Design a protein around this ligand. Structure first.
Ligand SMILES: Cc1ccc(C(=O)NC2CC2)cc1-c1ccc(C(=O)NCC2CC2)cn1
Length: 347
């Protein structure tokens, strides 16, 4: 039956949540809503509670809301954020208008870790191993992160990690000297072609490089500057990659550039474990068809001390046919409502 809900104003909005959640405290906007840390008295867990703002304002928001809930209801892996609870104060479809998502709360993100701790190579191994283990699971359900960066990698005090914000920025956001663009595969930064899950491996390459050196790998001041930094390191594209760039416009620009050889990674990453250098070479490949995959990378010798092939699970089939569907707001809202009401807590 239905819990009792109580009301409070947080972030100049009214938050209405079940009594089990106490000591709500704002933690800083999340994807499509604001988030509060809270104490879940029922489980004894520190949780994060996201209130979607205007979930059913438009078709875009309504589909968006359904998308996020579906994604969260499906993911059940130690290295991927999952759904602890989802609720609405509404007693019926008619009054259903607010959606709250509850997940684990981690004490830091990877951006905090990289900024204020010294990471040994063993830390680099473990952290990257977990990101690759989570991505294998995500990629197996045909989900692409597309925006993997240190700020959406949550980490507990034991250095155990979860991936957030997969499967869901404007132009201004990607503009200038900004982390929102530093980890993006070039094919997506410059819209070269229909991209796919390989975009996430480039992002991992960029994060791993940064854990090893403490410094952003390609901190471009804009898209062009960033492309120049990238090509300086990995070489300009060859004939075969070029043909695959289906944007005639992008192909044309990139061919205007002076050809440059790929650099020696052992010279760029002095002191680094040679195995780490090898994996960076396999991840940081301009041609997405030729980058190592998450499943392949887990078997790389850099991860010998963590790799366990019987303990790197794939996901249950994820039906995302809804993605190609056009529906009205009320249709997306009712679909969402069914998913709220049919939620079953993890055990
Ligand atoms: C509450 C919530 C709802 C949805 C998604 C999400 O990933 N949705 C996309 C996947 C569909 C993520 C969160 C979440 C989880 C943990 C943290 C956290 O630990 N914050 C504290 C920060 C890390 C220091 C912050 N936010």
């Amino acid at each position: 039956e239905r819990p009792t809900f109580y009301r409070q104003e947080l972030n100049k909005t009214i938050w209405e949540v079940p009594e089990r959640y106490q000591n709500l405290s704002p933690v800083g906007s999340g994807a499509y809503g604001s988030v509060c840390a809270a104490f879940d008295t029922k489980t004894g867990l520190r949780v994060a509670v996201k209130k979607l703002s205007r979930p059913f304002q438009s078709i875009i928001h309504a589909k968006r809301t359904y998308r996020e809930l579906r994604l969260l209801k499906h993911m059940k892996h130690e290295n991927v954020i999952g759904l602890l609870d989802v609720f609405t104060p509404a007693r019926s479809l008619e009054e259903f208008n607010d959606v709250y998502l509850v997940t684990h709360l981690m004490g830091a993100d990877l951006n905090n870790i990289v900024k204020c701790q010294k990471l040994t190579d063993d830390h680099v191994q473990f952290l990257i191993y977990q990101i690759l283990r989570g991505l294998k699971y995500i990629h197996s359900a045909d989900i692409i992160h597309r925006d993997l960066k240190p700020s959406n990698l949550a980490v507990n005090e034991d250095c155990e990690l979860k991936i957030l914000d997969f499967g869901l920025h404007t132009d201004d956001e990607m503009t200038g000297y900004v982390a929102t663009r530093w980890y993006r595969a070039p094919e997506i930064m410059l819209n070269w072609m229909h991209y796919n899950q390989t975009v996430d491996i480039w992002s991992v390459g960029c994060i791993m490089a940064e854990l090893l050196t403490g410094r952003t790998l390609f901190p471009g001041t804009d898209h062009i500057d960033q492309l120049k930094l990238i090509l300086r390191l990995v070489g300009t594209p060859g004939a075969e990659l070029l043909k695959k760039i289906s944007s005639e416009s992008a192909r044309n620009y990139i061919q205007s550039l002076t050809q440059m050889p790929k650099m020696n990674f052992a010279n760029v990453f002095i002191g680094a474990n040679p195995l780490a250098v090898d994996l960076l070479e396999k991840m940081l490949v301009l041609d997405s068809d030729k980058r190592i995959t998450a499943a392949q990378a887990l078997a790389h010798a850099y991860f010998a001390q963590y790799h366990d092939p019987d303990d790197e699970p794939v996901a249950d089939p994820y039906d995302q046919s809804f993605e190609s569907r056009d529906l009205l707001i009320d249709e997306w809202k009712s679909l969402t409502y069914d998913e709220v009401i049919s939620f079953v807590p993890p055990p």
